[PDB]
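queue> holo job accepted (A1H02)
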Amino acid sequence: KDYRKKYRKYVRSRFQCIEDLNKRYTRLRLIKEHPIKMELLFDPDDEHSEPVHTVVFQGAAGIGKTILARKMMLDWASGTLYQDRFDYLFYIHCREVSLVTQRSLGDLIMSCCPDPNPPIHKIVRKPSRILFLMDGFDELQGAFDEHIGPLCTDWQKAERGDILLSSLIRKKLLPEASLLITTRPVALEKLQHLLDHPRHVEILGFSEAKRKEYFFKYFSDEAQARAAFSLIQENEVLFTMCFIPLVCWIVCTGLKQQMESGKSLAQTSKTTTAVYVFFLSSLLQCAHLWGLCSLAADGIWNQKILFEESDLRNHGLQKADVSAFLRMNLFQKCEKFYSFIHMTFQEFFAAMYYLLEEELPSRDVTVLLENYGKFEKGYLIFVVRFLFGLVNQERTSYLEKKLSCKISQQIRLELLKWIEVKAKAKKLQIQPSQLELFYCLYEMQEEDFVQRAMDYFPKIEINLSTRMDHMVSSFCIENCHRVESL
Ligand SMILES: CN1CCC[C@@H](NC(=O)Cn2nc(C(C)(C)O)n3c(cc4sc(Cl)cc43)c2=O)C1
Ligand SMILES: Nc1ncnc2c1ncn2[C@@H]1O[C@H](COP(=O)(O)OP(=O)(O)O)[C@@H](O)[C@H]1O
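queue> job finished
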């Protein structure tokens, strides 16, 4: 009662803005059964009439899972959301939770609290008044399998981080406490098996009117905001891709540098690889290109998303270099840890590690592909996708001229043999799907490669769900023509 006041005051200041104001927050399109009012998420809006205790938010990389979870904490602490339903909302940031370290649910709850000695026994008195907000399930570093056990039913017993979170998700630990898990659809395969009567909600990103809203929030000058949005409107691809809020931020940040220069506002970008290479080349006034890539490849191959001072100092990134990338919105920072500005940037530098000119992790693309779609290595969706785009010889920049074209050709051969094995195999059943291979060929864009690869698919068997799916598939199909077509 009196401690809840202190906790809400703490939550109000800790979730004040996007990093570490919430005026740049633009509404997200949330749809259920995967017009959703957040207050009604836990209501039994069915004939069940028994409250919903598990709510799953499935959203792709950069769609706004963390931003929605942070807005949730702030709105709740401000008496605007669930004022009547929950006494405490605990924010569990999955990228900080060790899956090996032995900790109890009490120790985890106390981790979310401001003071060293919180009234843990008083908090746990009414478990139904607690909402556990697990943000980024897919960011749990290491393996997470449904065979772990025994399951824990004591909030005070210290268990392995995987047993602990597994017992909380399965609703064995505080059975009637509420849960809000945000995950990428890829990890929804691991998750589904633990879930107890969950309510599924899909984060779809920005509406065509919310992309315009974002651009106008980003640029204070209305003349700049309208010129930036008109560029997107002119470019079919950038308009389509700007449904992902992270794409809206990357695009806006890139046009700011171009605006400061005085160059006629233009962005020809046709792929995610083109956008990522455009944003990165705008930062360049690179010297630590080997260091940045090895850090990301090591962080993907050895499951490190947060890097302390020692992790950066061994990769050649001294005090000044870290402070330059933090200022250039390449790195992020009261945790004494540093990470990439996003997970998709760590995957861009991991893909780039395999193509760098020589002048610690394994650069064998064969072993990288062997771990594709595996939870342990983070699924490697964007590593492989960016790898397809960067290998395209009919594309260059000052950044790409620093990549070895000899190993880029060898890797181009192995990516064709990978498509050939995936497509000409009925027994696959898991990632990559046919649509996912279509996204890879879309990053390639080169017609000699795309046409050779599309001749491996016997029949087109895909499920379209977005206008991005239509664009990608449309491109691959129009480059799939039978040899004797006359
Ligand atoms: C696992 N597969 C199965 C087949 C269908 C796949 N659909 C997509 O990937 C659709 N899509 N498209 C992109 C683009 C094309 C911009 O790269 N992005 C998405 C999130 C982010 S964050 C970011 Cl940077 C780019 C990006 C997104 O969801 C998912
Ligand atoms: N609703 C939103 N309004 C404004 N910006 C947003 C919103 N959602 C996401 N973003 C932008 O996307 C970036 C990454 O989003 P985030 O939620 O961290 O991604 P993920 O879905 O991987 O958790 C943020 O830093 C921000 O710039």
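queue> Residues 1-205 form a domain with the Rossmann fold fold (CATH 3.40.50.300).
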